[PDB]
Amino acid sequence: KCVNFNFNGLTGTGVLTKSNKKFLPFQQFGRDIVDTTDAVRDPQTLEILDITPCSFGGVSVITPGTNTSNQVAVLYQGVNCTEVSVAIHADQLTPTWRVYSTGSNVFQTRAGCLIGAEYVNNSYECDIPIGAGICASYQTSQSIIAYTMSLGAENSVAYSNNSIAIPTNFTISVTTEILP
Amino acid sequence: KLIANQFNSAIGKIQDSLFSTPSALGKLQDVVNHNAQALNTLVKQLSSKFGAISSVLNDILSRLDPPEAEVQIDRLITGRLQSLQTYVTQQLIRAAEIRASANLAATKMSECVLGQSKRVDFCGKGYHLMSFPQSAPHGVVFLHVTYVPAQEKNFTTAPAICHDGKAHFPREGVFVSNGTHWFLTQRNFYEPQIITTDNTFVSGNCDVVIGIVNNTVYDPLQLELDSFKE
Amino acid sequence: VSMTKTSVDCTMYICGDSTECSNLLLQYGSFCTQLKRALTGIAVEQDKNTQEVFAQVKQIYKTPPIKYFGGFNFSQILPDPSKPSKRSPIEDLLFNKVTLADAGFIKQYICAQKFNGLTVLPPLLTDEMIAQYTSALLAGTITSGWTFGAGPALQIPFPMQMAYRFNGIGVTQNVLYENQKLIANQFNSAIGKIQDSLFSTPSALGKLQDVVNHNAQALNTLVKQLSSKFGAISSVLNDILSRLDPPEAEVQIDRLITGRLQSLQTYVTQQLIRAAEIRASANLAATKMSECVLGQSKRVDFCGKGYHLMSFPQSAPHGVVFLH
Ligand SMILES: *[C@@H]1O[C@H](CO)[C@@H](O[C@@H]2O[C@H](CO)[C@@H](O[C@@H]3O[C@H](CO)[C@@H](O)[C@H](O)[C@@H]3O)[C@H](O)[C@H]2NC(C)=O)[C@H](O)[C@H]1NC(C)=O
Ligand SMILES: *[C@@H]1O[C@H](CO)[C@@H](O[C@@H]2O[C@H](CO)[C@@H](O[C@@H]3O[C@H](CO)[C@@H](O)[C@H](O)[C@@H]3O)[C@H](O)[C@H]2NC(C)=O)[C@H](O)[C@H]1NC(C)=O
Ligand SMILES: *[C@@H]1O[C@H](CO)[C@@H](O[C@@H]2O[C@H](CO)[C@@H](O[C@@H]3O[C@H](CO)[C@@H](O)[C@H](O)[C@@H]3O)[C@H](O)[C@H]2NC(C)=O)[C@H](O)[C@H]1NC(C)=O
Ligand SMILES: *[C@@H]1O[C@H](CO)[C@@H](O[C@@H]2O[C@H](CO)[C@@H](O[C@@H]3O[C@H](CO)[C@@H](O)[C@H](O)[C@@H]3O)[C@H](O)[C@H]2NC(C)=O)[C@H](O)[C@H]1NC(C)=O
Ligand SMILES: *[C@@H]1O[C@H](CO)[C@@H](O[C@@H]2O[C@H](CO)[C@@H](O)[C@H](O)[C@H]2NC(C)=O)[C@H](O)[C@H]1NC(C)=O
Ligand SMILES: *[C@@H]1O[C@H](CO)[C@@H](O)[C@H](O)[C@H]1NC(C)=O
Ligand SMILES: *[C@@H]1O[C@H](CO)[C@@H](O)[C@H](O)[C@H]1NC(C)=O
Ligand SMILES: *[C@@H]1O[C@H](CO)[C@@H](O)[C@H](O)[C@H]1NC(C)=O
Ligand SMILES: *[C@@H]1O[C@H](CO)[C@@H](O)[C@H](O)[C@H]1NC(C)=O
């Protein structure tokens, strides 16, 4: 569990688990490559406990724009949706606001846990990027949906040993390039 | 007449596209917004205490004896100096980015406006014909006029035409067939022409070339001579 | 082409799980906001760079099911359908060779993986999407030459595409047709030699490993700086609050706030400089992709030594490899 611990004079916040570290009778505490305490010897029973920091991450808000709709989706970056769901049920998350979190609106992305958007199989061009191929948009009763973005339409080329395509017409096109 | 009409239509569409879309000029508006934000942030930093009892120097001088007033003022000096130093560093980085953009714009102007660039996608999408500069606040806008192929048709082709045992290759073009007759055409615009000894060149016998087809190459001189001499 | 994207929460890094420190940090103004904007801008720039280099094609092109291109063997260039992610053999080799990063993405989850308020963000495009863009570019180049780059894709037999590229460099068509088998054999040999060279040379991909190493070093240094005291009695805020009364804790905390804030500003400054360098590299990669993959460049040494004929892109982690 995520708890506030105080072992003798070393205090902190973290999750204590049974360790797999080969402590000698000599060592009392452990540290990783960046000199952060990550293991302790329990003053009683001498159990060696690993300290995992409590889960955290950034929060992103996906908004269609307030001139269209006031519904938003929340991405909890960096964590598994199982831990977010448990934190919601336990009322442990630092933000005090909540999202409806109804069935089918919680989707696991590579970026994080996306709550408040319906994932669909149909692929669309990317609108609001989320990450790892997943984008969100506001579409139909309009609601926020999430999808794996399309890269483009397919166009097979009619290649053959003796077939060539020759233009019979042309277009004169004018494009705009803006440079600071 | 068709080309002039397409050009005029494209220019009108460009004016309408820039007018209609609020984000068309985002690249320059972002530069303006970043400079305005940098100055507003730099001014707002003067309000911060940076650990001092007050952001106003006169309050520090009026409240404390010289020793503590100097300590609190030195703390504010450190805070403001760090804020200015950060501002200048960020402006140096932004200036380097703008320099790179300006060098690209100058290259685009030389290659696209003062000449006809062969570089693909450098002077717009399509085959480059010409470009026109327009000025803009803090920047330049280029109108790139290009040739885009349209309405293609697929034809049967061959690398060479075999006449009297000799392999004929296009001088400037590609051999195409409509299903009954073979013609030489330019690659970028369908315009069939009769295959003659003036349009093709001869190198080697009809064996090595893979996919050579049999057809007649029309030599004009012989045809005239068979009339001249009778 | 791209740099590892990071996002750093100023408050957690400087004043983790410390209300008093956070309240003191609020007296320095917008600095935390400015660093957040700088890192967000970098992350957006890296996704823009990847999209500009690889997403240059409007449609996804495919090769024919009958992969006969006049004797030219592209099996080592085109996607290998039997493996997950559909990378080509060369792309798969590149992926196996340079992926020494600590994942490089969140993956729904340094021993602590720098979980001190430093979050690495995933790219917008996955390796599969980049491979798909590369495959589309390869299919377009192979089946339509440069007509694909300028406008709609127009099919042309591959040896005639080579014939026109030969005319481009200044060699007649009959040289290719008379020597077509020799040219195809030399091409296939060169491709095999490239695969062997990349496999056998650990240093071949040094540019991308160096980018990964520099970002790993920057994050390792930023985390390491948390252990410094910067003149304080202790590097741990909880020891300062538990040991000292507020009026002294504010002094020791202020010293630590100054040290950590300086560490974040130094980190952000180096990331902005590296972002500018990566953006310049990405712009060069996009220029090369347009000039040499979507056309036949006439610029000397721009795309390989010798007279340019063509090029083929290959995806690599955080970058692009061109075969000229
Ligand atoms: C090559 O393509 C161009 C278009 O890019 C063709 O020109 C276009 O031809 C159509 C008719 O097929 C014109 O539409 C007509 O316009 C008149 C305008 O008064 C209207 O009254 C008619 O009812 C009809 O809408 C179109 O305007 C014209 N475009 C231009 C710019 O002139 C051209 O014929 C094509 N050539 C070949 C060989 O395919
Ligand atoms: C492939 O192209 C060739 C040449 O472009 C086509 O042959 C030509 O077809 C036209 C059809 O109108 C012929 O015109 C007709 O000629 C006769 C006299 O030969 C005349 O009495 C008619 O009033 C009309 O003018 C043209 O002569 C003919 N030329 C040759 C050399 O055959 C051919 O049909 C095309 N094939 C396909 C499948 O598109
Ligand atoms: C295009 O090139 C690829 C290779 O770059 C060709 O695939 C290769 O085909 C040879 C055929 O003998 C394979 O050789 C194998 O060697 C092992 C021993 O090393 C032997 O046990 C096998 O029975 C076989 O003889 C080679 O492994 C294979 N390579 C790959 C990567 O598949 C392909 O056939 C070429 N395409 C054309 C149309 O020529
Ligand atoms: C131009 O240079 C190419 C090579 O870059 C020449 O092709 C090469 O010709 C030699 C023979 O002179 C070939 O060696 C032979 O290979 C066979 C393979 O079975 C072997 O059995 C023979 O004992 C001998 O080693 C070589 O393989 C071949 N290379 C290629 C890629 O085809 C070409 O002949 C030269 N042309 C002129 C006009 O100089
Ligand atoms: C092009 O014409 C030549 C004849 O001028 C063809 O050559 C003949 O080919 C047949 C078999 O197809 C042989 O039986 C003859 O002996 C060949 N004669 C000569 C003089 O070579 C040639 O095959 C034709 N090519 C095509 C593609 O039709
Ligand atoms: C005494 O210490 C032992 C080992 O540390 C522990 O198992 C036991 O419960 C302790 N007894 C107490 C705290 O009464
Ligand atoms: C091209 O020629 C080869 C010759 O081996 C043949 O196998 C292939 O099927 C031909 N392509 C088509 C589209 O027929
Ligand atoms: C190309 O070849 C024939 C027409 O000659 C036809 O079967 C096929 O659909 C054509 N495809 C395109 C894209 O023109
Ligand atoms: C995320 O949680 C699910 C819950 O069952 C688990 O199966 C999955 O392995 C977890 N993924 C990671 C990366 O921890």
Residue numbers in the entry:
A (entry chain C): 537 to 676, 689 to 728
B (entry chain C): 921 to 1150
C (entry chain A): 729 to 837, 850 to 1064
What do the authors say?
The JN.1-sublineage KP.3.1.1 recently emerged as the globally prevalent SARS-CoV-2 variant, demonstrating increased infectivity and antibody escape. To investigate the effects of N30 glycosylation introduced by S31Δ and two RBD mutations (F456L and Q493E) on the structure and function of the spike protein, we determined the cryo-EM structures of the recent SARS-CoV-2 variants KP.3.1.1 and JN.1.11 along with engineered variants JN.1.11 + S31Δ+Q493E, JN.1.11.1 + S31Δ, and JN.1.11 + S31Δ.
Prior studies also indicated that the JN.1 spike protein exhibited either a “one RBD up” or “all RBD down” conformation. JN.1.11 showed an NTD structure similar to JN.1. Besides, while F456L alone did not affect hACE2 binding (JN.1.11.1 has F456L compared to JN.1.11), Q493E alone substantially reduced binding affinity, which is also consistent with prior research and is likely due to the electrostatic repulsion between hACE2-E35 and RBD-E49317. Additionally, S31Δ did not markedly affect the thermostability of the spike protein compared to JN1.11, JN1.11.1, and engineered variants, as assessed by nano differential scanning fluorimetry, but retained a substantially increased melting temperature (Tm) over the SARS-CoV-2 wild type (WT) (Wuhan-Hu-1; GenBank: QHD43416.1) (Tm of 46° C vs. 32° C).
